């Protein structure tokens, strides 16, 4: 019954090709709703969900101003990191940031987040108590001491427990039809002989929201993972998700394998059997 808001940003330096590129996106649960791209012509935060289009022009100007300031801050932080790691200015590097909050089905604050990675690896993160940091190496520890002395953690709590929560709640109401709906998985199963000894069974879940789901194979009632394969959950492009799980079985034995499907929109877990 809880929900989440997340913002994700990526800065990529381009030595000799100009200033670093900055791309930010915003999600409520698994539904995107804004974006900003420093190389786009508009230079604006742009809508990506229908329920956000109903925000007025002061919203888009303010949000544009905030994301642009972030792009400059991480411009700078890319330079400083190069210094801390004693790296040459000729190489390209990435700085990723994530921040947001969870609310309970209650409507009330559950969790806040604020985290960085450099070249794909943890740098510094705000711990759950919102009073302390976890740094990944000696370089991030310089930043860690700097941020403790300046009480950055305390100064982030207004946003994480106020603005963040307030906006997420408003979004959940302006978009109840989209964001508070559950789409149960439509399931089927497929069967392909691959020898006269063996066949593959593939268990499908289609058209479901939110993305969280579990597919498991049992043989004769016991969980089986040997000879199975499970793909990453993936977007259909219409706002729903897809996933499948497959198992190679001895020809003739298909009927002792069952696939089990758990999802929030399933009152009861589904069982599929060929």
């Amino acid at each position: 019954g809880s929900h989440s808001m997340r913002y994700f940003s990526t800065s990529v330096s381009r030595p000799g090709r100009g200033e670093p590129r900055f791309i930010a996106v915003g999600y409520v649960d698994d539904t995107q709703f804004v974006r900003f791209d420093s190389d786009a012509a508009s230079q604006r935060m742009e809508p990506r969900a229908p329920w956000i289009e109903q925000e007025g022009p002061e919203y888009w100007d303010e949000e544009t101003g905030k994301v642009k300031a972030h792009s400059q801050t991480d411009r700078e932080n890319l330079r400083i990191a190069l210094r801390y790691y004693n790296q040459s200015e000729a190489g390209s590097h990435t700085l990723q940031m994530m921040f947001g909050c969870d609310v309970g089905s209650d409507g009330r604050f559950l969790r806040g987040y604020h985290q960085y990675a450099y070249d794909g690896k943890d740098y510094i993160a705000l711990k759950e108590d919102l009073r302390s940091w976890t740094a990944a190496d000696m370089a991030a520890q310089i930043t860690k001491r700097k941020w403790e002395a300046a009480h950055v953690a305390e100064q982030q709590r207004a946003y994480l427990e106020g603005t963040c929560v307030d906006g997420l709640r408003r979004y959940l109401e302006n978009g109840k039809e989209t964001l508070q709906r559950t789409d149960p998985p439509k399931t089927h199963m497929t069967h392909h002989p691959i020898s006269d000894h063996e066949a593959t069974l593939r268990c499908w879940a289609l058209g479901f929201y939110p993305a969280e789901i579990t597919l498991t194979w049992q043989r004769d009632g016991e969980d089986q993972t040997q000879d199975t394969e499970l793909v990453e959950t993936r977007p259909a492009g219409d706002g729903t998700f897809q996933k499948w799980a497959a198992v190679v079985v001895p020809s003739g034995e298909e009927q002792r394998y069952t696939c089990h499907v758990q999802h929030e929109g399933l009152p009861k877990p589904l069982t599929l059997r060929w």
Partner: protein, 99 residues
């Protein structure tokens, strides 16, 4: 520090010859975010292909969706060509109507 893309090629709905559909190439789990993703129809690159905005997972690995409206037929073959620094040659992944 460098992670190869996982690469999935699929239609939005179950394929039916003659009926319009969406052709998807989903790449995920990769780093860095520099990447080229093209859709091929009988070996030729399709010109109007869209893609989602750069986002990433809890482990900081990137994911993108490339897609195009299309109408499958019995004779046309589709593939997704993925070009990335961890791949010594671009990976070319043909479309399987059941993945």
């Amino acid at each position: 520090i460098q992670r190869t893309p996982k690469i999935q090629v699929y239609s939005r709905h179950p394929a039916e010859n003659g009926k319009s559909n969406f052709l998807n190439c989903y790449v995920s789990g990769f780093h860095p975010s520099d990447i080229e993703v093209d859709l091929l129809k009988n070996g030729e690159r399709i010109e109007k292909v869209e893609h989602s905005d750069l986002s990433f997972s809890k482990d900081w690995s990137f994911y993108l969706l490339y897609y195009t409206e299309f109408t499958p037929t019995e004779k046309d073959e589709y593939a997704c060509r993925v070009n990335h620094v961890t791949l010594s040659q671009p990976k070319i992944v043909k479309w399987d109507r059941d993945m």
